[PDB]
Structure formats: structure tokens, C-alpha cells
Design goal:
The structure is cut from a larger assembly and holds chains A (327 residues), B (62 residues), C (348 residues), D (363 residues) and E (90 residues).
Chain B (H helix, E strand, L loop, with lengths): L4 H12 L2 H7 L7 H6 L1 H11 L3 H6 L3
Chain C lengths: L1 H10 L7 H17 L3 H14 L6 H14 L5 H14 L8 H17 L3 H9 L12 H17 L3 H4 L7 H4 L5 H16 L4 H10 L8 H17 L4 H12 L9 H8 L8 H7 L16 H16 L5 H6 L5 H13 L4
Helix pairs in contact in C: 1-3, 2-3, 2-4, 3-5, 4-6, 5-6, 6-7, 7-8, 11-12, 12-13, 14-15
Chain E lengths: L11 E2 L49 H7 L21
Classes of the chains: A mainly alpha (327), B mainly alpha (62), C mainly alpha (348), D mainly alpha (363), E little secondary structure (90).
Subcellular location (chain C): Cytoplasm; Nucleus; Cytoplasmic vesicle, Secretory vesicle, Synaptic vesicle
GO molecular function (chain C): deNEDDylase activity
Keywords (chain C): Acetylation, Cytoplasm, Cytoplasmic vesicle, Nucleus, Signalosome, Synapse
Chain lengths: 327, 62, 348, 363, 90
């Protein structure tokens, strides 16, 4: 109740370890580790995370999935093998108290699929040790969906090593930027399914490479139509207007907007609706994120988002490193 | 000797048990399978007694 | 004239400045290719397809140009538009995920050509490849309902009830949004006919009987559904489920209006079946209900023999194998195999 | 910086050379990228070339620099993908004369904080190579180090993939089955239960379950053999040929012995693979058992002979399956006929009268 | 204006045959997840990638659930329609 429902993902884990840690030693020393008092401590702790004072019962499995996203976040570099390995051991003990295992599985499925497509995977060992702790506690049936998602990413990793060797076999007008980022998805193992998007136009820079991926994937499976997901896939850009050529990994939705600036310095709202080739409901959320940053700046004194307002292009962008993640 | 326990137990149960009791005692039990595998001449007696092959099971007895 | 056409398309390939300026100059080039005739028309129209599949031209300009290009194609004769549809689908094949709206537009006109040339199997395979369920762009409800209705109609005329009733289930999901109650009745009637094609007259007699007691079914369709259930009960084999279905139709007063009251009365009272009773009932049966079943040329030739053996188990004391076959016009080798199968199944 | 390592690596990949391109990927390592994935991908391309030609002293020199950056310099996501890729590629081109020296030097550079998969996977391949060299001194030394922990696959509850005590026993099962020695297969199955109680669910777990189904099928327990063959077909499906086709014949054989085999395929691991003529031979065998017909069961053995007659395991049970079909047909024919003739059932079954008198006694 | 260049870029590889999976119709798991008869046996059934058994009505469920339903009634009396096997295997 000291934090009500605004609990932090790094503070909720330490709050449980401090309460349980001060009681796991008072019983094993004074009471000589009696089995009667040990069962009462685990039974009473299960009702704390399930029946609390604030009216926020669904926030317990959400904070548990958010804690794994911070340890697996890849901003630019990485982490050591001592603090991450020691924090994963104390995480399986807190999960034994929360009885809402069905809500945690739905939150972890959509979070793991987003960290792989966006490229936010920092340590591969954090994903292997996570599915192993859930199998030893819950069982092999509950961790069956998580094991299929990890094995599917390992198959695409082995395919990237074979496609990388093809560059040394007659290839000189292909090497330019980043290499393959194949993320094989399924219909039952993965939460994302083959659903119609919003008939995107696809920028002219992304016309190649992806075209060769459809013909390469058609050789392994006899007839397999693939659909792209522009909501989780991100690209990259190179700005040569500052003192250092910075690279910012932007979303593929912003690439179609920046491609329209090659004809004129400014692009109105009526011309941006035809270049993106989509509805106005999706362009509103896209132009909103570009206005808060230093990518698209307004003119005059104070210009809001309107149907007749223009949108200029700003060369100065807030950067500091190369290939920085925005999610 | 270990080559005589299969004959001592194989010939005693062949006279007191029928064909259905042999498939559940000297066949279903995995402990007696190791003793019958050493001497193949004793394992063929149980198989010939279950397939109603009394003609070939008698010639191998003498 | 085809030499100057390809030179004008390559100049505007990398040129980009406006949306209406690029689409305005490209429309004048495609207009001149339509007015051409002879061998110069085929070479000019094929150059426009290769100019749109490149990565230099924007997808917005290529989509707007391909939309109006598919409108003037049906105006051309079938001897010229046929070679264009087969050549355009091969160029956009590697980029089928980008121009999904243009692929279905070409396949919609290609299937109409095979329909006019009396080809039901060829026109049905064209609409199948259209990404209706595994596509990135969803069309309207009227566009999907018309496409699914043409596939089931072409497969039905080609003598294929399996492929015709397979694609009709996809259109049933969008039929709930409309208020057409007549289309929902035919959705379950057509499925009941496929179940009867597998020689399952016992199970089909219960589906047609339960559908006649509903309220959404029209009065003209409830009487026709009871006639199919009465015919399936006679064509079914003699057993325990046949006696329960014959007594249910006799208690209903709706069976008196049909002309098949004499067949139901002679089958419920365990009466005799002569050679003139099976011929009158076979004339009122559907053409898809008479198959080559050993003797005769109808399915009723087997149900009559099985029905006479069940009635003889409680009336005839003991008859020889030579006398039992002469009363049914069947050899002695057939009267023994049929009677032996009824005792094992527990029906005689 | 990360800008100089991008333009230099892009121009070096254009028309690579087996000797000239090695100098372009070496000067980029002295700049030390700040990402630092630009310097990690440059050394990965040099390993894929040194293992095909050149020699072995130059390959070990470039392999030590790859194992250095793995902590905070390079992300562990891109680093773990390179370790599992090179270890699976050098075991095919290089022979055993140069593969044993590459495993001893690797353990000296993996003594950091994370000592789970980096120590178990590197020590697993060492135990499999000692059996071919007939070395008893080095085999006992590596076994005492793994016995200090609780489990041989996981130190606590972290990374898996790395079992040596069960991999040695599993390699002897695949060899002893070809010699038909049931006295040794029974002793190896009891020793696999202690390791099974301390391992998760990798690939070796599905190998020890195959020997359990073969032992129970010989004693007469057809229900216990089906539970072990079905649990092993899921693990063998991930690997594939040739350890997947041979395991499918043992799964369908135990299903037809329970009276009867109405389920030819209970999983999708073998439904779309029936297009091959070798796998289709097992599909037609189950179809002849459901309808209960001895005329169609013998036709499969005559048509498919180079897949079912070459295995001595299924050949010893082909006689019992043919006798169980004759019993089901005799029941459906003896009910109507009260006093049926003896030659009557022999003509309908299209069999000689020599086996009819012997089958009527057992029935 | 800005520099745009890519070497070998790609998105995802999705696939869904026939219609989209709608959490089956007898439970809440996916078409390839452990339903009821798949997680309660853990011996004679599957445990990782479950099987997909299609039908004539273009609606797939589970092989362990459709086998026990057709044992006592081959037809479907819930709506008086055709029920048969079609297209084995995803």
C-alpha cells in the first residue's frame, strides 16, 4: 500500500526478496526449519500477491514480465555475466507465489516476440535460462509454448550462416548495410498470425533484398505466401548533415514519410496520405511521433496537426551513437 | 551353474502349468528372460507349446 | 512505333518530382499504346508491365497506372487479351506481395475468358489463387461473396461435389451479416445431399427429418424435405434404426399429402414387396439416387432384399436356399451372403 | 569508432578472396568498434574461410580472438550464435586429428562467470571422441570433474545442452542393437533412470527411451512399449534423417499389437511425409490391419520388400500380426453359421488347410 | 537528400493455411497448442508441436478430440451438416 498501484518493475522484486529473505532465515535457524512453519509461510505469501489492498490484481503478472524486459533490453552495448546470472536465480522464487500463471504466459508471449523482431535481444543466455526455470517449477506442458518459440529462432539463426556464405560466391553489388534478420513465425506457437495489415506502399529502398527473400523461402516449402508486419519490423537510416554520420534505427513506417522529402523540402498533409497509401487513422499516430522529435518540425510560430498544415524536414536530429534502438 | 537354472525351472513349470500360465510367468517376467537367452534350446520349447506344435516340441525333448 | 514507346518509358523511370506530374505524363504513353494495332500493339503493352515492376518507379504511381490498365484490357478481343494476362502474372509473380490489389484484378478478368469458352475447371482454378484468406489487403463483402459463389458454381457443373461444397463454407462466415434468410436454408440443404452421396441412407434420414420441424424453413421447403427423408428410409438397410424411422413418418399427418403413401404403408405393416412396387418407387427418385448396385440399376435393389429377409424372420418358418432365391429373382449364391451379413451385425 | 568499420567491411565483402581478403578484415579489428557488433562480424567471416583451406595454425590464431569479446564488449545474443555455428561446422571438414586439439584450448578461455553451456557443450564432444581413440586415462579425468556438481546437464537451473554421462551410454545402445545382445541393453536401461531424474528435455532424453520400448515389446507388454516409442518420436523428429525414418516403423508396430491399429498417425510429424515410397510402406501396413483382411496384408510384404524385410526387429513380429487378423474374421463368420464346415473357412480366407487346423486349436 | 542503402533486409515469415486460427472451438488454446486431451495424456499424445486434423467443413481441431467424437457418432447432429475427414495434416 505504500506504492498503491504505481509499483516499479525493479522495486517490486526487491520488496518480495526483502520480506521473504528476512523470514526464510528466522525459521531455518530458530525453528530448525520445521515443515509445519514452512508450509504456512508459502501459503500466506500466495494470498498477498493475489488479494492485496489496492484494486490492481492484474498488475502482478505485468510487473513480472516488465522486469524481464529490462534485463533483456539492448540499448547499445551489453551487460556482465555476474549481475544478470545472479538476478535470474532470485526471480524463479518470486514466481512461485503468483498463482496467475495464465496471465503471465499471455504477457510474456507478446513481449518475447517483440524483443526478437525489433532486435532488442541482448543476451541469448537469458532466453535459454528462462525457459529452463519454468519447466522445473511449472512443468513441460506449461513451458511447451515457450520452448517452440525459442527453437524457431534457432532455426533462422542457422539459416543466416548459410546465406552469409553466399556473398563469397559471385556477389559485389549487394553489400551495403545490415545483413539478414530472419524471424520465422508460426500460427500456433507464435501469437502473431497471417492477418491483413493496412495495404502499405513499401518504400523504394526496401524493394530489393525482401524480393529475393520471397524466392529463397519458396524453395524450402512448396508454396508458402509470407506477409510482412510493419508494426514490429524496423529499419535504419544514415544522416550525413551533422559532424558525425549517425545511424538511427527507425521504424519502417517512417521510411515512407522520409522518402517523400526527396522531391520537395516540405510535404503537406494531403500529399503524405497518398505517398504512404493507407488510412488517415494510421497516419495520425505516425506523424505524432515525428513531431515530438527533431525529425519533422513545424513552421511559422505554433503550427499544430491539421489537414492543411505543411510538414518541413529538419536535418538536425538528436543522436549520440550508431544504430540506437528507439523501443 | 548358471546354465542349469534355466533347465531346472523350465522343466518344472512345463509339467504343472498350461500354455496360458507360461506366457505370464516365464515370458512376461524380465528376470527369467536373461536365463533363457543363454540356452536357445529351452526358449523354443515355450514357443512351440503355445502355437499348438506338439509334433516338433516332442522331438526336441528327447 | 514500338521503338519510341520503350524510349519514353525509360526516361521517366528515374524521374520524380510530383504525384500528379508523374502520373499525368505516364497516362499519355499508355493511351498511345491502345490506339496502336497489329504487332506494334502487343510490343507496346508489354513494355508498360516491365516499367512498373522496377524499383525505380514508386509503388503509388504503379498502382494507379495498373488500376486503369485493367479496365481497357476487356475491351480488346480475347485473341489478344489472353496472352497479356499470362505474361503480366509472370512479371509481378516475384512481387506478388506488393501488388496484391492488382493481382486479383487480373485474375478476375482472366476467369471470365475461360467461362465464355466453356471451361469450368480452368476458370475455377484462377479464382482459387486469389489471396482472399492469405492476403495483406481485405476486400469488401460483396467482392468476396461474389467470388466464392462463382467457385462453387463452376465446380458443381464440372461434376465435383467435393470441391464445390468446400469453398462454400468460407462464404457462410460473411452471410451472417446480411438479412437473406433464403441463403441460410440452402446452406444446410446442400450439405445434406453430400452426406447422402456416401451411401449413408440411415444417417441421412435423421438430418432431413429434423430440418422439417424448424420454423425458419419455408412451408414449401418443409414438404420437400420430408419427401427426401421418406425416400432415404426405404433405400436404407433393414435394421433397428429403420423401424424407428418408419414409425415416425407414419404418425405424422404430413405424409398423407405426398404421392408415396403406398410405399410407406407397405413397408410399415411388413407386407410383401413384388416386382411392381419397386419399379413405381424408383421412377419418383432423384437421378443421383440410383447407382449400379450389383443387380439392377438402382440402389433400391439392395434395400428390398435386405428388407424381405427381416420380415421373413418373424413370418416364414424355415425356407431352403433354393426357394428363397426364386422368390426374389436372385441366385442362390447371393441369398446366402446377404443373409449372413445381417446376423453378424445383429439386425436379423 | 563504428563508422570506419562499416565502410571498410562493405568494400571487403565485394568479390572476396581466399588469401587477399584476409588482410582487409584484420586491420578493422585494431580500431575496436564501440557497438561493438561491427568487429564481431568481421572475425566470423575469417573463420568460415580458414576452416575450408589454408591450414590449422592460422585457424587457431583467429579463433582465440573470437572467444575474447563475449562480456560487455559484444552482446551475448550475437556471440552465442557464433559459438554454436562454428562448433557445428568444424566437426565435418576437420578430422579427429585436429578436432581434439581445438577443444582443449577452448576450455582455457571460457573460465569466466558464465560456465554453463560454455563448459558442458565443449566437454560433451570430448567424451564422444575418446571412445574412438580408445583412451582410458583422459576419459576418467573428465568424468570426475562433472561428478562434483549435482546434475551432469545443468549446474543449477540455467543453460542446458551438454550431457556426457548419458551420451556415452546412448552410443552403446545404437551399437549393441545391431549385434542382438539383450543382456547388455537391459543393464543400460536401468542406469539411464538416475540421469533422467536430473536432466530437462533435450535430445539425449529421447534416445534412452527408444531402448525401453524394444525391451518391453519382447517380453509381451505392448502397452508399455507404445508409451516409450511415442515419447521418443517427438525428439527424433527435430533431428530428422536418418534417425527419424527408422523410429517410425517401431511406433506403428506397437499400435497394431494392442488390438487393434485404428490410428495410423496420431501426430503431424509423419502425416505430410508419407509421399516418400519408404515412408508410404508403413502407411499401407496399418490400412491392411484396420479392415481385417489377410489377402491385403500379404500383398504389402511382396510389394515393399526393401524396407520391412531388412530389419530383423520387425521381422520377428511379422508372424504374430498375421495370426491376429485371422481370429477377427473367424468371429464375424461363425455367428450365423451354426455347424460350419472346416474347408469353408479355408476357401474364404484363400489359405491352405495346413494352417487352419493349427489355428483352430489356438483359437 | 538522406542516404538510404540496404544490403540484405527482410521482415517476418508468416503462414496460415485456409482460415485463421480462432482458438479452436472446444477450448482456449491455439491450433498447435496443448488443448485438453493433449496435455492430460503426456505419453500417447504430443507435447511440443501438436497435430492439426482438418475436416470437410474447413475447420480443424485436434486429432485426439475428433477421434473420440466420431467413435460413437460419425455425423454431426449439432446442426445437421456433413462431417468427414479431408486433407490430413498443418
Amino acid at each position: 500500500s505504500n506504492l498503491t498501484q504505481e509499483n516499479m518493475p525493479t522495486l517490486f522484486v526487491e520488496s518480495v526478496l526483502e520480506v521473504h529473505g528476512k523470514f526464510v532465515q528466522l525459521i531455518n535457524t530458530v525453528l530448525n526449519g520445521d515443515q509445519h512453519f514452512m508450509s504456512a509461510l508459502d501459503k500466506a505469501l500466495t494470498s498477498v500477491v493475489n488479494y492485496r489492498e489496492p484494486k490492481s490484481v492484474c498488475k502482478a503478472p505485468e510487473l513480472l514480465a516488465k522486469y524481464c524486459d529490462n534485463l533483456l533490453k539492448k540499448s547499445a552495448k551489453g551487460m556482465t555475466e555476474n549481475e544478470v546470472e545472479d538476478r535470474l536465480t532470485s526471480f524463479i522464487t518470486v514466481f512461485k507465489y503468483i498463482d496467475d500463471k495464465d496471465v503471465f504466459q499471455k504477457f510474456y508471449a507478446r513481449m518475447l516476440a517483440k524483443r526478437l523482431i525489433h532486435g532488442l535481444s541482448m543476451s541469448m543466455d537469458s532466453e535459454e535460462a528462462m525457459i529452463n526455470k519454468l519447466k522445473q517449477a511449472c512443468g513441460y506442458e506449461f513451458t511447451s509454448k515457450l520452448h517452440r518459440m525459442y527453437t524457431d529462432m534457432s532455426v533462422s539463426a542457422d539459416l543466416n550462416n548459410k546465406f552469409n556464405n553466399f556473398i563469397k560466391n559471385q556477389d559485389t553489388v549487394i553489400d551495403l548495410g545490415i545483413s539478414f534478420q530472419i524471424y520465422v513465425l508460426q500460427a500456433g506457437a507464435w501469437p502473431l498470425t497471417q492477418a491483413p495489415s493496412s495495404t502499405f506502399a513499401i518504400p523504394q529502398e526496401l524493394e530489393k533484398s525482401v524480393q529475393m527473400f520471397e524466392l529463397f523461402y519458396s524453395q524450402h516449402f512448396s508454396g508458402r505466401k509470407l506477409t510482412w508486419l510493419h508494426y514490429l519490423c524496423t529499419g535504419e537510416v544514415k544522416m550525413n548533415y551533422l559532424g558525425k554520420p549517425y545511424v538511427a534505427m527507425v521504424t519502417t513506417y517512417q521510411m515512407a514519410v522520409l522518402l517523400a522529402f526527396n522531391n520537395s523540402e516540405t510535404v503537406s498533409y494531403k500529399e503524405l496520405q497518398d505517398s504512404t497509401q493507407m488510412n488517415e487513422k494510421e497516419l495520425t499516430k505516425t506523424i505524432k511521433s515525428l513531431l515530438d522529435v527533431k525529425m519533422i518540425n513545424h513552421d511559422s510560430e505554433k503550427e499544430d496537426i491539421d489537414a492543411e498544415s505543411s510538414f518541413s524536414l529538419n536535418m538536425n536530429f538528436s543522436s549520440k551513437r550508431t544504430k540506437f534502438k528507439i523501443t | 551353474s548358471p546354465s542349469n537354472v534355466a533347465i531346472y525351472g523350465g522343466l518344472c513349470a512345463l509339467a504343472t502349468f498350461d500354455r496360458q500360465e507360461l506366457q505370464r510367468n516365464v515370458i512376461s517376467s524380465s528376470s527369467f528372460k536373461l536365463f533363457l537367452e543363454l540356452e536357445p534350446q529351452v526358449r523354443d520349447i515355450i514357443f512351440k507349446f503355445y502355437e499348438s506344435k506338439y509334433a516338433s516340441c516332442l522331438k526336441m525333448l528327447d | 512505333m514500338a521503338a519510341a514507346v520503350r524510349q519514353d518509358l525509360a526516361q521517366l523511370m528515374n524521374s520524380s518530382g510530383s504525384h500528379k506530374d508523374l502520373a499525368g505524363k505516364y497516362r499519355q504513353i499508355l493511351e498511345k499504346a491502345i490506339q496502336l494495332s497489329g504487332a506494334e500493339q502487343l510490343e507496346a503493352l508489354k513494355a508498360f508491365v516491365e516499367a512498373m515492376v522496377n524499383e525505380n518507379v514508386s509503388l503509388v504511381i504503379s498502382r494507379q497506372l495498373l488500376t486503369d490498365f485493367c479496365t481497357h484490357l476487356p475491351n480488346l478481343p480475347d485473341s489478344t487479351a489472353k496472352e497479356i494476362y499470362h505474361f503480366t502474372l509472370e512479371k509481378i509473380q516475384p512481387r506478388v506481395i506488393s501488388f496484391e490489389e492488382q493481382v486479383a484484378s487480373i485474375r478476375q478478368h482472366l476467369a471470365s475468358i475461360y467461362e465464355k469458352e466453356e471451361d469450368w475447371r480452368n476458370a475455377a482454378q484462377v479464382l482459387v489463387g486469389i489471396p482472399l484468406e492469405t492476403g495483406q489487403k481485405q476486400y469488401n463483402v460483396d467482392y468476396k461473396l461474389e467470388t466464392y459463389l462463382k467457385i462453387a458454381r463452376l465446380y458443381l457443373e464440372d461434376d465435383d461435389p467435393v470441391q464445390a461444397e468446400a469453398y462454400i463454407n468460407r462464404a457462410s462466415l460473411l452471410q451472417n451479416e446480411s438479412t437473406n434468410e433464403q441463403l441460410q436454408i440452402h446452406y444446410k440443404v446442400c450439405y445434406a445431399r453430400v452426406l447422402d452421396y456416401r451411401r449413408k441412407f440411415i444417417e441421412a434420414a435423421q438430418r432431413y427429418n429434423e430440418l422439417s420441424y424448424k420454423t425458419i424453413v419455408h412451408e414449401s421447403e418443409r414438404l420437400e424435405a420430408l419427401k427426401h427423408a421418406l425416400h432415404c428410409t426405404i433405400l436404407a438397410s433393414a435394421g433397428q434404426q429403420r423401424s424407428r424411422m418408419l414409425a415416425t413418418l407414419f404418425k405424422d399427418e404430413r405424409c398423407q399429402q405426398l404421392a408415396a403413401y403406398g410405399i410407406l404403408e407397405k413397408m410399415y405393416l411388413d407386407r410383401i414387396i413384388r416386382g411392381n412396387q419397386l419399379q413405381e418407387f424408383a421412377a419418383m427418385l432423384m437421378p443421383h439416387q440410383k447407382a449400379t448396385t450389383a443387380d439392377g440399376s438402382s440402389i433400391l435393389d439392395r434395400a428390398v432384399i435386405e428388407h424381405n429377409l427381416l420380415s421373413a424372420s418373424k413370418l416364414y418358418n424355415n425356407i431352403t436356399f433354393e426357394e428363397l432365391g426364386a422368390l426374389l429373382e436372385i441366385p442362390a449364391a447371393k441369398a446366402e451372403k446377404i443373409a449372413s451379413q445381417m446376423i453378424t451385425e445383429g439386425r436379423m | 569508432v563504428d563508422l570506419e568499420n562499416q565502410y571498410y567491411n562493405s568494400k571487403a565483402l565485394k568479390e572476396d578472396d581466399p588469401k587477399a581478403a584476409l588482410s582487409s578484415f584484420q586491420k578493422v579489428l585494431e580500431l575496436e568498434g564501440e557497438k561493438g557488433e561491427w568487429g564481431f562480424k568481421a572475425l566470423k567471416q575469417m573463420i568460415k574461410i580458414n576452416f575450408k583451406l589454408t591450414n590449422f595454425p592460422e585457424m587457431m590464431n583467429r579463433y582465440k580472438q573470437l572467444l575474447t569479446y563475449i562480456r560487455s564488449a559484444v552482446t551475448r545474443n550475437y556471440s552465442e550464435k557464433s559459438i554454436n555455428s562454428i562448433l557445428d561446422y568444424i566437426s565435418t571438414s576437420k578430422q579427429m586429428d585436429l578436432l581434439q586439439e581445438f577443444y582443449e584450448t577452448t576450455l582455457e578461455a571460457l573460465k569466466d562467470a558464465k560456465n554453463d553451456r560454455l563448459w558442458f557443450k565443449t566437454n560433451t564432444k570430448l567424451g564422444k571422441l575418446y571412445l574412438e581413440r580408445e583412451e582410458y586415462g583422459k576419459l576418467q579425468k573428465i568424468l570426475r570433474q562433472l561428478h562434483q556438481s549435482c546434475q551432469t546437464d545443468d549446474g543449477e537451473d540455467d543453460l542446458k545442452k551438454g550431457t556426457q554421462l548419458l551420451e556415452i551410454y546412448a552410443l552403446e545402445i545404437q551399437m549393441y542393437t545391431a549385434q542382438k545382445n539383450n543382456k547388455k541393453l537391459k543393464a543400460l536401461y536401468e542406469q539411464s533412470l538416475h540421469i533422467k531424474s536430473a536432466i530437462p528435455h533435450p535430445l539425449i532424453m529421447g534416445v534412452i527411451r527408444e531402448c525401453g520400448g524394444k525391451m518391453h515389446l519382447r517380453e509381451g507388454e505392448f502397452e508399455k512399449a507404445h508409451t516409450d516409442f511415442f515419447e521418443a518420436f517427438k525428439n527424433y523428429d527435430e533431428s530428422g534423417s536418418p534417425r527419424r525414418t527408422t523410429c517410425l516403423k517401431y511406433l506403428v508396430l506397437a499400435n497394431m499389437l494392442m488390438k487393434s491399429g485404428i490410428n495410423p498417425f496420431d501426430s503431424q510429424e509423419a502425416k505430410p511425409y508419407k509421399n516418400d515410397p519408404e515412408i508410404l510402406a508403413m502407411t499401407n501396413l496399418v490400412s491392411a490391419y484396420q479392415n481385417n483382411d489377410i489377402t491385403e496384408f500379404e500383398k504389402i510384404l511382396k510389394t515393399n520388400h526393401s524396407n520391412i524385410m531388412d530389419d530383423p526387429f520387425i521381422r520377428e513380429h511379422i508372424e504374430e500380426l498375421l495370426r491376429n487378423i485371422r481370429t477377427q474374421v473367424l468371429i464375424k463368420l461363425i455367428k450365423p453359421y451354426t455347424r460350419i464346415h472346416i474347408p469353408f473357412i479355408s476357401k474364404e480366407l484363400n489359405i491352405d488347410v495346413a494352417d487352419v487346423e493349427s489355428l483352430l486349436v489356438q483359437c | 537528400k538522406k542516404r538510404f542503402e540496404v544490403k540484405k533486409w527482410n521482415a517476418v515469415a508468416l503462414w496460415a493455411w485456409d482460415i485463421v486460427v480462432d482458438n479452436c472451438a472446444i477450448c482456449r488454446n491455439h491450433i498447435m497448442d496443448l488443448c485438453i486431451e493433449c496435455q492430460a495424456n503426456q505419453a500417447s499424445a504430443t507435447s511440443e508441436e501438436c497435430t492439426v486434423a482438418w475436416g470437410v467443413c474447413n475447420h480443424a481441431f485436434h486429432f485426439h478430440c475428433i477421434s473420440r467424437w466420431l467413435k460413437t457418432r460419425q455425423v454431426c447432429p449439432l446442426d445437421n451438416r456433413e462431417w468427414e475427414f479431408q486433407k490430413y495434416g498443418h
